[PDB]
């Protein structure tokens, strides 16, 4: 794996540089670096190929450079339809392809599409059947990137959580859902549980109690 900054955040007009660090046996030994762009539901798209060359349908916004073993994608006159993922890739000398871990980008020149959150407590019929499931329904958000956190009272909870990847709603916004599995005794023995959805620096938190 080639090393990328897990996350970078920005703003319109001004520029951003994304980095890629490999080794002399790949990025250092060829001019075969490629930068891919991908949005939440789509497949990766080619932007820059062979270090600096432009693929068809790509603005000079994107430019590619290399410094020994470090690839860089500089982006200028920033827009907003980025807001997603940049992967780097290089040929190796074992005649293979290696990809970076993926710069997950988070630009800011768009408003939003803040998430509607709905939290349901365990149903009586479920508790009665000796289980408990907290359900967190998250809809109408754009762009389709969300992190979901659960807390019992004030403290975080990571076990018993299943969370979908955001998928496109029929409005060109996005939905996701998150489930918290509990023993009825856990549920009963807490002031409250909370589902908190984090979108674009902003957070929405719904809270339920027995």
């Amino acid at each position: 794996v080639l090393t990328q900054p897990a996350s970078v955040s920005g703003s319109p007009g001004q520029s951003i540089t994304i980095s890629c660090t490999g080794s002399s046996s790949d990025v250092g030994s060829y001019n075969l670096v490629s930068w891919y762009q991908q949005h939440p539901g789509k497949a990766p798209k080619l932007m820059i190929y062979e270090v600096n060359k432009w693929a068809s349908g790509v603005s000079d916004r994107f430019a590619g450079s290399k410094s020994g073993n470090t690839a860089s994608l500089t982006i200028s006159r920033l827009q907003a339809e980025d807001e997603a993922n940049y992967f780097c890739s290089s040929s190796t000398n074992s005649a293979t392809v290696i990809f970076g871990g993926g710069t997950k980008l988070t630009v800011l020149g768009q408003p939003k599409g803040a998430p509607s959150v709905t939290l349901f407590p365990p149903s009586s019929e479920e508790l009665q059947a000796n289980k408990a499931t907290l359900v967190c329904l998250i809809s109408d958000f754009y762009p389709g990137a969300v992190t979901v956190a659960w807390k019992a009272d004030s403290s975080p909870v990571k076990a018993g959580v299943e969370t979908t990847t955001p998928s496109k709603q029929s409005n060109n916004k996005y939905a996701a859902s998150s489930y918290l599995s509990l023993t009825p005794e856990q549920w009963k023995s807490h002031r409250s549980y909370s589902c908190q959805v984090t979108h674009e620096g902003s957070t929405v938190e719904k809270t339920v109690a027995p």
Binding site: S91, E126, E162, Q169, A175, Y179
Partner: protein, 223 residues
């Protein structure tokens, strides 16, 4: 017009083989290298192979070197990827992509120039066997328009189809994509928002239907 179309999502028990196809149109599959990469849900891209459809020559990393069998059927313009010994870490979207032009005098095999992608093929791993769903009512907040719904818990496999009041209520209905749990089963929920004063007078029922276990559940939801 250059297009790559992958076979439909799939599901295998751990310790089993999967095979994915990749149909090409707009071009002749054997003129170009086919690359296979993969993307675990919410994770990054992992390059898995290239294959020269004329020679059959195929390089993969050490990681995928004994589990993978790439083949082609250029009679059909189709490429295949077969992955053996699946485990839950094998769970991802598998992509095929078109790389460089094939020539004996210029080697583009290892060029990561993927100018065309398939839409991706989700493969899931689960040691789960058919199971009917357990349907629980999601009571309107008592405070709350009002949100009420149904939880469709621990079923296998997909799909569960869902309607409300036998289809007489469609407005404000949102049936969410199922989550694939670590246990290997699915859950989903379907929620509808209704005028608050309708509670207590209008009865609400979700019609959960799970053909794969031949069960139908019409669950009454109430405050």
């Amino acid at each position: 017009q250059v297009q790559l179309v992958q076979s439909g999502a799939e599901l295998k028990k751990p310790g089993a083989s999967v095979k994915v196809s990749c149909k090409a149109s707009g071009y002749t599959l054997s003129d170009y290298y086919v690359h296979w990469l993969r993307q675990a849900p919410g994770q990054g891209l992992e390059w898995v192979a290239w294959i020269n459809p004329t020679s059959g020559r195929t390089i993969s990393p050490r990681k995928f070197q004994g589990r993978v069998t790439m083949t082609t059927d250029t009679s059909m313009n189709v490429a295949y990827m077969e992955l053996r010994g699946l485990r839950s870490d094998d769970t991802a979207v598998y992509f095929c992509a078109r790389g460089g032009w094939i020539s004996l005098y210029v080697d583009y095999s290892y060029y990561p120039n993927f100018d065309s992608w398939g839409q991706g093929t989700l493969v899931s791993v689960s040691g789960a066997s058919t199971k009917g769903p357990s349907v629980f009512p999601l009571a309107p907040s008592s405070k709350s328009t009002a949100a009420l719904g149904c939880l469709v818990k621990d079923y296998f496999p997909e799909p569960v189809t869902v309607s409300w009041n036998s289809g007489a209520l469609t407005s404000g209905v949102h049936t969410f994509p199922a989550v694939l749990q670590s246990s290997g089963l699915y859950s989903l929920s379907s929620v509808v928002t209704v005028p608050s004063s309708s509670l207590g007078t209008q009865t609400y029922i979700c019609n959960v239907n799970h053909k794969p276990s031949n069960t139908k559940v019409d669950k009454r939801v109430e405050p």
